[PDB]
């Protein structure tokens, strides 16, 4: 028995599902695409993404800048980049406030984000609503596993803006913000929330991510088989033919287009515009626009 | 659900002797051929990816990556000329799988190797999924053309220092070994759909399980199917870390408090298989097979 929960594979089909009694608990899965309209670059957009804009650091490959083994050999490019990107003041987007609407309508079980920009918090989601799957810059740690001395943000900021490579005062090993680099463990909260959240999710809303890194990309496969999954993104993601070096596990992807497609919908365009379009369908558009307006003005005050 | 009486080689052996254990699938990588003189990829210092400095690659894997290959095919065809001429013998591990087949237990061997030592050991093409392809045939890389060429054609080009070119469309021609970014053989998929439905035991040997989709295979068995790893190091087990190869929960659980079906025997693949053969009472038989087959090869 496969439960067929969407009456059609469109944004309109999803919206009707959301209004029904059957849709109680939504998980948002989000990445750097939801913050681009605020001024923050993403990673893997050709030419505009951060990984196509690190020429000056002379890295062996772009991912090295956020990679734990490279970092330990050559910490300077990371701290140089942090000094550049940290100052930027950004505001949440329409997409972030849409998630606030879910929260305030009793629909948000959790937002899992791969971003460190904190814009989900700034938009009004609370700690408990959030899994910051790829860490936070708020706290820092010595990288030495036998030490792990914790340091606060003021300590880290002071080091970066004094152009001093932060070192632990106990063991002299490098210190870094708790943002998750390639090769580094995810916060424990990720796994503990995931195990219970994904048993009871009625809709996955996947926004502004290419699903190109594990274990985050595995989350789509943790949902029950009947749970509809809506992608709002510039491009399809999670749907590709298998090949050697593919990121997802075999049969772990999205199925928007095949003869067997039953539950996955791709809305192709900007996240803000897709969130506006979906809010319109749900009768929430004015409320959303009102909230954005009010919260931006308040942020300026 | 627990089928092993204990999570040890002994427990696995007793399970293999039970009526329940009809169908065994072997999942193998380059570790089963190191004792035969062939380097693996990822072992420190000795592995192939730690010994490509001369080709000045941006990263080691680029030598077996399709887009890099089209732009710079010279390194791979240089590397192939060095390695193709080596002559090697199947290992005790390879003959242990031959024994599985002859005992009527082998449903399939899925290999990530292109050395053919499985075939040389006596496994037949029907027993095999050569998951990462074969050198025996070669194809033009152009999707509109796909002209096939045999081994003789490819060797003539390699050993004359001529970058192989399709005689029709002039595109590059490579052996049907699977590069990063390339499709796996059709057979991998059709066999996978059918083989893992009723599989009673997975035997994973000599692989770091560091590449997809091959690494997914362990998670295709039913949840109750025991899985035994014979390998120098543990593979398939970690906490969630960014960039990990395994899907979340698609790995092995040897050491957790909830561990119920995975067993890791750490050591040499050869000695591992001997130890298991011993526990099944096959040790003399295996040793006889190895000796005769190695003598047969020596006799050229
Ligand atoms: N305004 C927009 N509207 C909709 N989609 C967009 C927009 N802007 C960009 N996109 C799409 O948004 C997607 C952005 O994908 P990626 O750039 O890979 O970011 P990630 O968050 O998935 O990266 C994950 C991790 O990898 C890193 O190493 C870090 O660890 C990250 O946390 C693309 O599909 C764009 O087409
Ligand atoms: N004699 C031995 N006994 C036991 N274990 C061994 C032995 N020798 C090596 N090992 C272990 O055996 C493992 C060797 O793992 P890797 O070197 O990654 O080879 P793969 O076949 O998995 O590489 C997969 C693909 O990656 C490439 O891109 C190609 O596409 C390959 O087909 C390690 O865990 C060793 O500790
Ligand atoms: N908008 C975000 O926050 C994205 C994109 C901007 C750069 C920082 C960044 C993001 N996600 C990350 C995950 C891990 C690390 Cl080390 C850094 C980042
Ligand atoms: N500018 C900021 O508001 C935040 C969030 C936006 C992305 C850049 C970014 C921030 N903090 C960082 C710390 C380190 C790095 Cl590499 C990048 C960043
Ligand atoms: N020499 C041979 O017995 C075989 C199997 C052993 C590994 C090397 C190897 C062989 N054939 C090859 C063709 C191309 C490349 Cl790149 C490498 C090889
Ligand atoms: N013993 C094998 O055959 C291993 C290790 C020796 C090098 C060739 C090689 C192996 N596996 C492969 C998979 C794909 C490619 Cl392109 C090449 C190889
Ligand atoms: Zn320390
Ligand atoms: Zn051709």
Author numbering:
A (entry chain A): 54 to 354
B (entry chain B): 56 to 355
Cite, word for word, the article reporting this structure.
Sirtuins constitute a family of NAD+-dependent enzymes that catalyse the cleavage of various acyl groups from the ∊-amino group of lysines. Sirtuins consist of a highly conserved catalytic deacylase domain of around 275 amino acids that is flanked by unstructured N- and C-termini that differ in their length and in their sequence. Of the seven members of the human sirtuin family, Sirt2 is mainly found in the cytoplasm, while Sirt3 is the main mitochondrial deacylase.
Using the diffraction data obtained from the soaked crystals, we were able to solve the crystal structures of Sirt2 in complex with ADPR and either EX243 (EX243 is the S-enantiomer of EX527; Sirt2–ADPR–EX243 structure) or CHIC35 (Sirt2–ADPR–CHIC35 structure) by molecular replacement. The asymmetric unit contains two monomers that show no significant differences [r.m.s.d.s of 0.29 Å (Sirt2–ADPR–EX243) and 0.23 Å (Sirt2–ADPR–CHIC35) for all Cα atoms]. The ADPR molecules of both structures assume a position that is almost identical to that observed in the Sirt2–ADPR complex. To our surprise, each Sirt2 molecule contained well defined electron density for two indole molecules. One indole mimics the physiological sirtuin inhibitor nicotinamide and occupies the C-pocket and the adjacent extended C-site. The other inhibitor molecule binds to the selectivity pocket of the hinge region. The carboxamide of both indole inhibitors binds in a similar fashion as the carboxamide moiety of the physiological inhibitor nicotinamide and hydrogen-bonds to the highly conserved residues Ile169 and Asp170 and, via one of the water molecules (W24 in Sirt2–ADPR–CHIC35 and W206 in Sirt2–ADPR–EX243), to Ala85, Ile93 and Pro94. The amide of the indole hydrogen-bonds to Gln167 and, via the other highly coordinated water (W3 in Sirt2–ADPR–CHIC35 and W203 in Sirt2–ADPR–EX243), to Asp168 and ADPR. The binding of the hinge molecule is mainly driven by hydrophobic inter­actions with the side chains of Ala135, Leu138, Tyr139, Phe143 and Phe190. Additionally, the carboxamide moiety of the hinge molecule forms hydrogen bonds to the backbone carbonyl O atoms of Leu138, Tyr139 and Gly141.
